[PDB]
Coordinates of C-alpha atoms and ligand atoms in Angstrom, one line a residue:
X10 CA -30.2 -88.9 225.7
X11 CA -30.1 -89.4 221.6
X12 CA -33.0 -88.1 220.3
X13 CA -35.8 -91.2 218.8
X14 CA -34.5 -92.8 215.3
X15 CA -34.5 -96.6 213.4
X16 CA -32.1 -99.1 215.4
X17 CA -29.2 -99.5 212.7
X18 CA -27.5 -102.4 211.8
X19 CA -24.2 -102.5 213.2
X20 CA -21.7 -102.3 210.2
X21 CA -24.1 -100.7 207.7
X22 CA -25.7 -98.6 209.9
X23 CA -29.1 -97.2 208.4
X24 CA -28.4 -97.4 205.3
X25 CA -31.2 -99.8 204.3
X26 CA -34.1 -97.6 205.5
X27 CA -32.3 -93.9 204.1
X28 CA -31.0 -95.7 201.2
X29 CA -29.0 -94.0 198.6
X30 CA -30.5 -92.7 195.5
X31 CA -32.3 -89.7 197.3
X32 CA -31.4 -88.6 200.8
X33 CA -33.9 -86.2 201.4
X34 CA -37.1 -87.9 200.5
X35 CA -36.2 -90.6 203.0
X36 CA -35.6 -88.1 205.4
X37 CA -39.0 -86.7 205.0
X38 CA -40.6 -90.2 205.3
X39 CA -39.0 -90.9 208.4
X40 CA -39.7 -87.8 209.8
X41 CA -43.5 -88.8 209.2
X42 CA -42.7 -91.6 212.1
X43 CA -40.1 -90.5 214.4
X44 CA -41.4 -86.8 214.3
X45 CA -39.3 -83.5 213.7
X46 CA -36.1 -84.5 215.4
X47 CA -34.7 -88.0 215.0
X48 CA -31.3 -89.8 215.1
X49 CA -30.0 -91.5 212.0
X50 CA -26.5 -93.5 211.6
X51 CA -24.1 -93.1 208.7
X52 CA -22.4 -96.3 209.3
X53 CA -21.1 -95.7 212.9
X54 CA -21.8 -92.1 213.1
X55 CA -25.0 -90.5 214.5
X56 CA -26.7 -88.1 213.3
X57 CA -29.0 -85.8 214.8
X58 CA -31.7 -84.5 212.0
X59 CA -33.7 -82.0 212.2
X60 CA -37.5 -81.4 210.1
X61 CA -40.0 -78.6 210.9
X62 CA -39.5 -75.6 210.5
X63 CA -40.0 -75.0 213.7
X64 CA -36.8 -77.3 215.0
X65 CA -35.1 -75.8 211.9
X66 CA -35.5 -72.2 213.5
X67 CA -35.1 -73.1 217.3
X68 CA -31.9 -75.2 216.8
X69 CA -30.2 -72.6 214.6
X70 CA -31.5 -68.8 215.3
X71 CA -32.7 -69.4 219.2
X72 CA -29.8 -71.7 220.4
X73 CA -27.5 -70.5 217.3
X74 CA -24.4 -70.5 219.2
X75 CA -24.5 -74.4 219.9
X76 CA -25.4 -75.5 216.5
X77 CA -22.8 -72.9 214.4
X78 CA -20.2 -75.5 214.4
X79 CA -19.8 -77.1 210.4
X80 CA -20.4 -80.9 210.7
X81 CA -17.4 -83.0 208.5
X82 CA -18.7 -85.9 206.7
X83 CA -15.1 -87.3 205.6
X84 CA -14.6 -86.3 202.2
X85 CA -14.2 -82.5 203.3
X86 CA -11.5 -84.3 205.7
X87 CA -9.2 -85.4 202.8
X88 CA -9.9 -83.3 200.0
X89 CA -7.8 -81.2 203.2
X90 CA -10.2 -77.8 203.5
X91 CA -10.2 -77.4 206.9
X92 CA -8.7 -73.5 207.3
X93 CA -10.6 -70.4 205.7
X94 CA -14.6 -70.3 205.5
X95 CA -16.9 -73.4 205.0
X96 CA -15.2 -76.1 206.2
X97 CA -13.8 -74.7 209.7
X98 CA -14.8 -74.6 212.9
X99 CA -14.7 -72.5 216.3
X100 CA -12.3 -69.6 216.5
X101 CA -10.5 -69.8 213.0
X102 CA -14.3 -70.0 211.8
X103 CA -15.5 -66.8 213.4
X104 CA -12.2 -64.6 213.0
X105 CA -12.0 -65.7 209.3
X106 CA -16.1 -65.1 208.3
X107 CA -16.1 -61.7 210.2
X108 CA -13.0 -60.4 208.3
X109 CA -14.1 -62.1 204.7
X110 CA -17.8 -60.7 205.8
X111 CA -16.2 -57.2 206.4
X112 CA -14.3 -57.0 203.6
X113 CA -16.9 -57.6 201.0
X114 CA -19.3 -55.7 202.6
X115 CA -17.2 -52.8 200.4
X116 CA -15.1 -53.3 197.3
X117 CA -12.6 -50.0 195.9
X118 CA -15.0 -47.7 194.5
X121 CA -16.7 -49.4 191.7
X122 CA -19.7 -50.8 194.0
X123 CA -20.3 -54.5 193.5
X124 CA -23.6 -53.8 191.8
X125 CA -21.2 -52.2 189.1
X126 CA -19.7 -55.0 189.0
X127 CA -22.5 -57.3 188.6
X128 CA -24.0 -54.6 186.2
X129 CA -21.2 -54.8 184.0
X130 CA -21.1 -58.4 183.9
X131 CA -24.4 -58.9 182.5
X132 CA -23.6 -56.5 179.7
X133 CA -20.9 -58.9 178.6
X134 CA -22.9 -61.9 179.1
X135 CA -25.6 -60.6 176.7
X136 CA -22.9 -60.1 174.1
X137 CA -22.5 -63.8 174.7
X138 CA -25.9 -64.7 174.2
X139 CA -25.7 -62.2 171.0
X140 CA -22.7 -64.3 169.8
X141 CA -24.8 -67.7 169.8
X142 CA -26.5 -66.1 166.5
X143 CA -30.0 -67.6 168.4
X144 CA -29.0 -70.7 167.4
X145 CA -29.4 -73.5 169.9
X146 CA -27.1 -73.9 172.9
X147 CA -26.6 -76.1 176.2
X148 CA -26.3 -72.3 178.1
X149 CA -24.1 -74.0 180.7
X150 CA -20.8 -72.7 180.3
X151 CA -22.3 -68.8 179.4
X152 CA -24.4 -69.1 182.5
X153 CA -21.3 -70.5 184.6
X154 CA -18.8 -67.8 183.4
X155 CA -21.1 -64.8 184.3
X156 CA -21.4 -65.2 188.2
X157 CA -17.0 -67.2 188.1
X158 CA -16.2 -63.8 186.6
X159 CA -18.0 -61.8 189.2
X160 CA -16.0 -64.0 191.4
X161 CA -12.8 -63.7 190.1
X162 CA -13.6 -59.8 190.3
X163 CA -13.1 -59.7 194.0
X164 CA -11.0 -62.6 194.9
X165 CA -8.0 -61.1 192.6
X166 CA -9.2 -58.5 190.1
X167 CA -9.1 -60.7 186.9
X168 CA -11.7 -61.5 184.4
X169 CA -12.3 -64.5 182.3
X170 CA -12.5 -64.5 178.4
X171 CA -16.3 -66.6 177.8
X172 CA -14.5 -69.0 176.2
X173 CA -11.0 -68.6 177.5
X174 CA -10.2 -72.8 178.1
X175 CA -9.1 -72.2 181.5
X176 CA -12.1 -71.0 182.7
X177 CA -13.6 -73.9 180.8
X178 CA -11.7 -76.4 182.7
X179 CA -12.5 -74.7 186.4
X180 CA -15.9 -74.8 185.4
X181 CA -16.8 -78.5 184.6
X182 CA -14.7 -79.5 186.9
X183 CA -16.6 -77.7 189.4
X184 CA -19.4 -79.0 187.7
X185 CA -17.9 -82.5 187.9
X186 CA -17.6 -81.8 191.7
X187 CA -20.8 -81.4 192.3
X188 CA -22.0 -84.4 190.5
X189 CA -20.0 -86.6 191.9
X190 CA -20.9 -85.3 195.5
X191 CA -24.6 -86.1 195.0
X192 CA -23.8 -89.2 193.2
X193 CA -25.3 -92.3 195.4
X194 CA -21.6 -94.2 195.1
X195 CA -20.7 -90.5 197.3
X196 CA -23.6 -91.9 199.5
X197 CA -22.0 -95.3 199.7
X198 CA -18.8 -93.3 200.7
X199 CA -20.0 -92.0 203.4
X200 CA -22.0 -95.3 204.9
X201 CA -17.8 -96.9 205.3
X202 CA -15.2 -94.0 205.6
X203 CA -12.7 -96.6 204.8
X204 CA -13.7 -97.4 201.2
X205 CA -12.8 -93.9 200.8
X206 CA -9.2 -94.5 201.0
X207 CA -8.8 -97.9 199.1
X208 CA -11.2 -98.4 196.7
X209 CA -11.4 -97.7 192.7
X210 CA -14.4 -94.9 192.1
X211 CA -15.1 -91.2 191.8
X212 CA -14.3 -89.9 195.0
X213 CA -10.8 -90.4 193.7
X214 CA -11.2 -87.7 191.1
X215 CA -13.5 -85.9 193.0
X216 CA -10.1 -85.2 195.1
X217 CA -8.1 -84.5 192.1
X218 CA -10.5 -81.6 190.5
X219 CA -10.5 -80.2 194.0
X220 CA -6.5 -80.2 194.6
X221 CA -6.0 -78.7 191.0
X222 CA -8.5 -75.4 192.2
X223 CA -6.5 -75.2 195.1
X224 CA -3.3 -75.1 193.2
X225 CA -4.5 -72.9 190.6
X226 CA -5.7 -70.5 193.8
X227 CA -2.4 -70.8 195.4
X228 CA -0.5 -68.9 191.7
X229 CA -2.6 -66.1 192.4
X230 CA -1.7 -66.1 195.8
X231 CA 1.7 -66.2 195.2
X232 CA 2.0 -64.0 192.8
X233 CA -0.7 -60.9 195.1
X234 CA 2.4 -61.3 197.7
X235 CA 4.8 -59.8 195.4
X236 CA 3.2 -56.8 193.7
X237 CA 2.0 -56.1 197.2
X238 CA 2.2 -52.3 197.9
X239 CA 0.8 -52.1 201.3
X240 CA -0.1 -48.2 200.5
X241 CA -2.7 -50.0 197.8
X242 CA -4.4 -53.1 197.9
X243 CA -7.5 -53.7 195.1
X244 CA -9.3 -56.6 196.1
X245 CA -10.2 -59.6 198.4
X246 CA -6.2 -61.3 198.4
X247 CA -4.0 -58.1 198.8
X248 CA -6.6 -57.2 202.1
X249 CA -5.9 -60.4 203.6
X250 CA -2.5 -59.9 202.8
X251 CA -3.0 -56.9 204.8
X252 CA -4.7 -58.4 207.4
X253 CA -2.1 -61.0 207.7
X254 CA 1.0 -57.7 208.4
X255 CA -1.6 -55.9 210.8
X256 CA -1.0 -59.1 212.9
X257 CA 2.4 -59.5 214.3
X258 CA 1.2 -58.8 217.6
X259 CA -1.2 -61.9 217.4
X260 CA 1.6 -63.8 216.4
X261 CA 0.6 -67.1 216.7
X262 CA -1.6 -66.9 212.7
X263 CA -5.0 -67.2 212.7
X264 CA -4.7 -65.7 209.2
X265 CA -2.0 -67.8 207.3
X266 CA -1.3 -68.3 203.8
X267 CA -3.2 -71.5 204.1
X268 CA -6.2 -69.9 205.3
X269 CA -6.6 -67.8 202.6
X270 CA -5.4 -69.7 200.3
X271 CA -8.9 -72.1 201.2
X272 CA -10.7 -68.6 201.7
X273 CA -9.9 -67.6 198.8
X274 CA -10.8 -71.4 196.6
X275 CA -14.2 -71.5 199.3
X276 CA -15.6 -68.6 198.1
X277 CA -14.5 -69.3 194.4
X278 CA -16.2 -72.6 194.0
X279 CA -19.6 -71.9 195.9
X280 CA -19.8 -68.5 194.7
X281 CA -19.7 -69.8 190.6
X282 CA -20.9 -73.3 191.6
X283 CA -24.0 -72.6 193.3
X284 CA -25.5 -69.2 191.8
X285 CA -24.2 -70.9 188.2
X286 CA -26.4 -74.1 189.2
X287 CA -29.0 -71.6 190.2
X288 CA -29.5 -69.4 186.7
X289 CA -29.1 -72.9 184.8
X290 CA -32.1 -74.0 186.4
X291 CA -34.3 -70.6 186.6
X292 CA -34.0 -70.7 182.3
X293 CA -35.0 -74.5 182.5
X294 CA -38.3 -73.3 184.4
X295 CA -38.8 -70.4 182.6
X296 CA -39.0 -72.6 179.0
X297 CA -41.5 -74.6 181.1
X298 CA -43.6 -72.0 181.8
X299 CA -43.9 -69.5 178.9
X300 CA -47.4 -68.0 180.7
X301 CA -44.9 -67.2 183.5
X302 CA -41.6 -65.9 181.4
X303 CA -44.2 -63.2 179.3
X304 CA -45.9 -61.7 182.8
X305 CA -42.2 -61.4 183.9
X306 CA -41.4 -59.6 180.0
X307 CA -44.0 -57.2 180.5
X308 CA -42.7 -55.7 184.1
X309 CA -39.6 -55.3 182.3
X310 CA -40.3 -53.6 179.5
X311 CA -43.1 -51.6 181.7
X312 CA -40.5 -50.6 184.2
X313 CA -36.7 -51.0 183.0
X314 CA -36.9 -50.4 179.0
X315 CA -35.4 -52.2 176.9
X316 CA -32.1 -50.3 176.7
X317 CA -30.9 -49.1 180.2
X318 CA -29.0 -51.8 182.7
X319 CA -31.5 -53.3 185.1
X320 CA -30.3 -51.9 188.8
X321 CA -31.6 -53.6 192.1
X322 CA -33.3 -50.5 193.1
X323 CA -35.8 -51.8 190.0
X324 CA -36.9 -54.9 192.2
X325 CA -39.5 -53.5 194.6
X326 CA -41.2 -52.1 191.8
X327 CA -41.1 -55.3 189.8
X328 CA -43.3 -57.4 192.4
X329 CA -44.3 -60.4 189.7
X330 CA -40.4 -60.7 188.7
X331 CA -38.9 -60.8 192.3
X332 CA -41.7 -63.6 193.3
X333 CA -40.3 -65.5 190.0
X334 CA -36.8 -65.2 191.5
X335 CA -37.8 -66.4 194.9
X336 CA -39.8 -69.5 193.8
X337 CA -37.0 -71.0 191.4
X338 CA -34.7 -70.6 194.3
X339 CA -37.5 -72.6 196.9
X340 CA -38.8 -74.8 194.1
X341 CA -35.7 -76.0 192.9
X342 CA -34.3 -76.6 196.5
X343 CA -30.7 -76.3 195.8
X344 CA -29.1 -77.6 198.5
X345 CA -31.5 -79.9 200.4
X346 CA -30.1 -80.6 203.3
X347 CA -27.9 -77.4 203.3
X348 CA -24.0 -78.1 204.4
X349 CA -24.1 -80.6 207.8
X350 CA -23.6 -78.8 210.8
X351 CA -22.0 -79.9 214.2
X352 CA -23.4 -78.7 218.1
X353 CA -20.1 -76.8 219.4
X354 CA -20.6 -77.7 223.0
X355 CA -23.2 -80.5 224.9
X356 CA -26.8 -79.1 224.3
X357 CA -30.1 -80.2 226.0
X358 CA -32.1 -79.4 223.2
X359 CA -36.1 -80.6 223.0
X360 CA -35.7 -82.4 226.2
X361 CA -32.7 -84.8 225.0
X362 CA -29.0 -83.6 225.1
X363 CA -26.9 -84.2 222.5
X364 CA -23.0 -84.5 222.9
X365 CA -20.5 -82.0 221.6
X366 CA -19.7 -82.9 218.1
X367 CA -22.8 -84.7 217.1
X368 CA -23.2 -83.9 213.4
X369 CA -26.7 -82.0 212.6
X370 CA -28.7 -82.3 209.4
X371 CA -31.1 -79.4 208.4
X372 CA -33.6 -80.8 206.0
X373 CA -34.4 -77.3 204.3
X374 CA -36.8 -78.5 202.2
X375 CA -38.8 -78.9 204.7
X376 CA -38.9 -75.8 205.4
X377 CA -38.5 -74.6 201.8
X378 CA -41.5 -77.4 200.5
X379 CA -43.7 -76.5 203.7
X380 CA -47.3 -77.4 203.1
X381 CA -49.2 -74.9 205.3
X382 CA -47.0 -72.2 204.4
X383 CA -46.5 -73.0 200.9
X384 CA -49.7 -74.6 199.2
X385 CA -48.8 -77.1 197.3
X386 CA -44.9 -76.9 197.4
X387 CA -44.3 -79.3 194.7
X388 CA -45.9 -76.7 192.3
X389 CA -43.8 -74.1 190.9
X390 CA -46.1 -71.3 190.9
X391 CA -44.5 -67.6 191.7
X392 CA -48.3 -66.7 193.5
X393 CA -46.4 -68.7 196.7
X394 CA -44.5 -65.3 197.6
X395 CA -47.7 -63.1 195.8
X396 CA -50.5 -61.4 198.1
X397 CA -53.6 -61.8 196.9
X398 CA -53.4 -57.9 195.5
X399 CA -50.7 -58.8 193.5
X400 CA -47.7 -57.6 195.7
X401 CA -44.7 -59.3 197.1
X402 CA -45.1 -61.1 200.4
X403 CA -42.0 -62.2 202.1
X404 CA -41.9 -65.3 204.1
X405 CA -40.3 -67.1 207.2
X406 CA -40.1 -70.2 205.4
X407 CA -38.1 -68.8 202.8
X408 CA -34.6 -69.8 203.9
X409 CA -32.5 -71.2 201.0
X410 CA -29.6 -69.8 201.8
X411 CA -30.0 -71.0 205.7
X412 CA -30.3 -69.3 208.5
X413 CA -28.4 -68.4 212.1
X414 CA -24.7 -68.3 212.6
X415 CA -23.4 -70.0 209.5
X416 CA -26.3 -68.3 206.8
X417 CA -24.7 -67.9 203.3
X418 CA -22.1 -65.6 203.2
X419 CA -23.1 -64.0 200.0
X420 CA -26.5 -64.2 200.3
X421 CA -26.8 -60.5 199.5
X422 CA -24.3 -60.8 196.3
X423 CA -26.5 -63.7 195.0
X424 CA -29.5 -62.0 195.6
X425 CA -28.2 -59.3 193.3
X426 CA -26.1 -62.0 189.9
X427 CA -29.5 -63.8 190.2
X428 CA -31.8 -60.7 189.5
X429 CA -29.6 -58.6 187.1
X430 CA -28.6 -61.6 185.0
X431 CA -32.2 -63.1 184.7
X432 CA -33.6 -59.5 183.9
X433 CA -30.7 -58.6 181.5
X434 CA -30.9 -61.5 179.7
X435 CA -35.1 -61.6 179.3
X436 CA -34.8 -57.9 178.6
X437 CA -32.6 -58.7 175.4
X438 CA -34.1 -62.1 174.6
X439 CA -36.9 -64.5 174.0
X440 CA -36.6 -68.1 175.2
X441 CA -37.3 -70.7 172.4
X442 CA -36.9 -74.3 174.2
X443 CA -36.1 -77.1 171.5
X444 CA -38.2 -79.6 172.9
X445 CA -42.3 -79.1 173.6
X446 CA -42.7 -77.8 177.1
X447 CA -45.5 -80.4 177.6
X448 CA -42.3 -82.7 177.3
X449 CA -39.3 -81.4 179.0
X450 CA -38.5 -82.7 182.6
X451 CA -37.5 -80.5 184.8
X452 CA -36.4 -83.1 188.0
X453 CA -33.1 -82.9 189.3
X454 CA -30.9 -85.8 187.9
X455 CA -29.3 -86.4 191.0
X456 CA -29.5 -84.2 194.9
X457 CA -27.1 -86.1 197.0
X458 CA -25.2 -82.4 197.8
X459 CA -27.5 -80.4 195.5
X460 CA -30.2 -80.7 193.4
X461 CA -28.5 -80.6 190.0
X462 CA -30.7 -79.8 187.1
X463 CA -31.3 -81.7 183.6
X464 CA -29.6 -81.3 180.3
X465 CA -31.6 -78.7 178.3
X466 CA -30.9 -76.7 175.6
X467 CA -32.6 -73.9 174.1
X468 CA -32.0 -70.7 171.8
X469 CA -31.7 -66.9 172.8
X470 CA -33.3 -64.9 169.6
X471 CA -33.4 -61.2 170.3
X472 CA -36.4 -59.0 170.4
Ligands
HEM501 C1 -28.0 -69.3 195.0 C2 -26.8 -69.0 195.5 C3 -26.4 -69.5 196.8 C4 -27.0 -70.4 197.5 C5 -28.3 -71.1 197.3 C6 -26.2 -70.6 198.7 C7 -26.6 -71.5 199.7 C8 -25.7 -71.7 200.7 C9 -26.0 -72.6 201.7 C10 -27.2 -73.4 201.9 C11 -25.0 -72.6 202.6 C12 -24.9 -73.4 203.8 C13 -24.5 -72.6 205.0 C14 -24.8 -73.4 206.2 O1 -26.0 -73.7 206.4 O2 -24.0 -73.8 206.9 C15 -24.0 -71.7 202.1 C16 -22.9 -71.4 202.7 C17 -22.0 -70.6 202.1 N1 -22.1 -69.8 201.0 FE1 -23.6 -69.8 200.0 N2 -25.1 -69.9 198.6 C18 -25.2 -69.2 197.5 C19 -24.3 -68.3 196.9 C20 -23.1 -68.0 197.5 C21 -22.2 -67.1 197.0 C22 -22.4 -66.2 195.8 C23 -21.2 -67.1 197.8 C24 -20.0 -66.2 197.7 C25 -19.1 -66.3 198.5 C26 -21.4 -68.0 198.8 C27 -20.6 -68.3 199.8 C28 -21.0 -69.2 200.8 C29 -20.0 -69.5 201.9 C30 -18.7 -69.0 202.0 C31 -20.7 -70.4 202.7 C32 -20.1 -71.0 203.9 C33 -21.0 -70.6 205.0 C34 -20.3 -70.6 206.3 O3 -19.6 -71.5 206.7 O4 -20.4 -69.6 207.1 N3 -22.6 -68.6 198.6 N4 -24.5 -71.2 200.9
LSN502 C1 -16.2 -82.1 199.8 C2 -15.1 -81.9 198.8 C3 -14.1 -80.9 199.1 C4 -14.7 -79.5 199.2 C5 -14.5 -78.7 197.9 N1 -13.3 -78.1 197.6 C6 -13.5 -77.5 196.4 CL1 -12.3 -76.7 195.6 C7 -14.8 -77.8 195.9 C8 -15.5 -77.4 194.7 O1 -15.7 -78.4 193.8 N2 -15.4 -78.5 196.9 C9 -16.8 -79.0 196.9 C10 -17.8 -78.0 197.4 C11 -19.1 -78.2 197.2 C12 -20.1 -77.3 197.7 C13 -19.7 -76.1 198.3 C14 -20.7 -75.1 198.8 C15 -20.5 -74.6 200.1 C16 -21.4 -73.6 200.6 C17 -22.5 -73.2 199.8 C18 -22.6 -73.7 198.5 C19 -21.7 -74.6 198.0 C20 -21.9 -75.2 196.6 N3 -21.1 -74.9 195.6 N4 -21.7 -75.6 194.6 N5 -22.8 -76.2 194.9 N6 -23.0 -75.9 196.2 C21 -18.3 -75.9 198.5 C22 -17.4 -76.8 198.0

């Protein structure tokens, strides 16, 4: 039955042997006992964790169907995102991905590259407008990727400094925090606290109903200037989507599916690539040796005046094995989002009930040993042949893997490359504080691995 794991207490649970300032590290240290599949309690609820790659990759490629259900730790419950993308489950879950999946598999046409493109000309006229004098690059790095959001979600742009982009994005940013905050871990140890107790889950809820809201105007207001002859982006072809069914009749696609669609994609599509560049320029004024070998393939291969383009990237080997070792370094998202087996599963000779909440430690897989020498390095030679070309990896799975993998992988792939080549094209990094000095360790990874504050000045070439 329930795989191996530490007998828990029987209020508490675990929660003395995980602890709460850093989930992951604990779950690595257990794993060193119990093995690569082991049984943890969150207060009262178990949950089945999975370590090796090798358990990673069986339980969610080879039987993908029975873990692609998303796991709810409570939070998620209340903050009420249940309908539209990440938070749902089962059928709503696979009509709803396929037909958001479709759709952005094509924009107008404008290509999405355009798009991005475009996007990092305006965000190096924002790091022009900084006059190289020192900035926390947070909200500039956060607007570029929110406005290639906002692009396809309902057409608009943001100003760089327009205030109600500002408030989206540290709230989003607050969001984050607060979810890999240990009083969020405490949270999740007694489900009950949640609902009568004085702490930052409260606002946590607040930040998150506002987004919605703020959503829900644009929705509105897409229904009206409809046009069915017309749509031009991802709202008005749900709108579609939601006339082309009158024969389903009973939804699947409400309002309040897209309206959460629509506020899923927007958060984690700014939130997470945001985090991501934030975090790459961090590591980059760490390692100047690093930032000029990736200089020269630029200016060797793009010049400096034409828009980098993502045909550019296989012959930029040096640059796309930077890219791919911030994003496994850093480890973003640890334990990715908690999944949930969709039916009962014998899996590894031990049968897990239907429901059971999964956790994928994907650093792991990201920080493996054998395939990664010494993972706690950041050195781009990890995805490097030994002749000095990209090698690709199995263990490279950041964005997850199986049923439920990131659905923009591919559009992250591109805002990450474009806006790190655009902006070292134009621009030399000068950190403010000694290299030797600055720490680079995330301040908190509860949710995510959030990075320091930094600061540092963008002085043309
Ligand atoms: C560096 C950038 C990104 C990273 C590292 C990332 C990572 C992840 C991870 C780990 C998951 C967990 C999926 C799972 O295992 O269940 C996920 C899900 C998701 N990501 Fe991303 N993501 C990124 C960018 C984006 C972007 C740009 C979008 C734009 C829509 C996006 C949309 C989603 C959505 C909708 C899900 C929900 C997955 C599902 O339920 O099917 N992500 N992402
Ligand atoms: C649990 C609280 C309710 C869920 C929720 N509604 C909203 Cl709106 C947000 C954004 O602050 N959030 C939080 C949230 C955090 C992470 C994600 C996410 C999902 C998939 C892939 C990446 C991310 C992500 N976004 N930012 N960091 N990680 C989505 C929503």
């Amino acid at each position: 039955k329930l795989p191996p794991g530490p007998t828990p207490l029987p209020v508490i649970g675990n929660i003395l042997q995980i602890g709460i300032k850093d989930i992951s590290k604990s779950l690595t240290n257990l794993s060193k006992v119990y093995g690569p599949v082991f049984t943890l309690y969150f207060g009262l609820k178990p949950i089945v964790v999975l370590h090796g790659y090798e358990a990673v990759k069986e339980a969610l490629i080879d039987l993908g169907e029975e873990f692609s259900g998303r796991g709810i730790f409570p939070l998620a419950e209340r903050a009420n995102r249940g309908f539209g993308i990440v938070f749902s489950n089962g059928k709503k879950w696979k009509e709803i991905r396929r037909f958001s999946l479709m759709t952005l598999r094509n924009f107008g046409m404008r290509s999405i590259e355009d798009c991005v493109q475009e996007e990092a000309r305006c965000l190096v006229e924002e790091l022009r407008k900084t006059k190289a004098s020192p900035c926390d690059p947070t909200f500039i790095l956060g607007c570029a990727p929110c406005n290639v959001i906002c692009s396809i979600i309902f057409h608009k742009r943001f100003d760089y400094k327009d205030q109600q982009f500002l408030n989206l994005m540290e709230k989003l940013n607050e969001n984050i925090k607060i979810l890999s905050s240990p009083w969020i871990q405490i949270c999740n140890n007694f489900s009950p606290i949640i609902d009568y107790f004085p702490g930052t889950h409260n606002k946590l809820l607040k930040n998150v109903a506002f987004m919605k809201s703020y959503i829900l105007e644009k929705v509105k207001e897409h229904q009206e200037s409809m046009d069915m002859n017309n749509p031009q982006d991802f709202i008005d072809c749900f709108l579609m989507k939601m006339e082309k069914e009158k024969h389903n009749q009973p939804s699947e696609f409400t309002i309040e599916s897209l309206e959460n669609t629509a506020v899923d994609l927007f958060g984690a599509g700014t939130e997470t690539t945001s985090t991501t560049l934030r975090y790459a320029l961090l590591l980059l004024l760490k390692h100047p040796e690093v930032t000029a070998k990736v200089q020269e393939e630029i200016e060797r291969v793009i010049g400096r005046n034409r828009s980098p383009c993502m045909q550019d990237r296989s012959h930029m080997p040096y640059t796309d094995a930077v890219v791919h070792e911030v994003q496994r370094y850093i480890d973003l998202l640890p334990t990715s989002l908690p999944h949930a087996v969709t039916c009962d599963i014998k899996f590894r000779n031990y049968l897990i009930p239907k429901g059971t909440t999964i956790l994928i430690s994907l650093t792991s897989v990201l920080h493996d040993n054998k395939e990664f020498p010494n993972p706690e390095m950041f050195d781009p030679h990890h995805f490097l042949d030994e002749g000095g070309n990209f090698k690709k990896s199995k263990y490279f799975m950041p964005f997850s893997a199986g049923k439920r993998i990131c659905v923009g992988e591919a559009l992250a792939g591109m805002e990450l490359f474009l806006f790190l080549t655009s902006i070292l094209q134009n621009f030399n990094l000068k950190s403010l504080v000694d290299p030797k000095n600055l720490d680079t360790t995330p301040v908190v990874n509860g949710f995510a691995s959030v990075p320091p504050f930094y600061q540092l000045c963008f002085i043309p070439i």
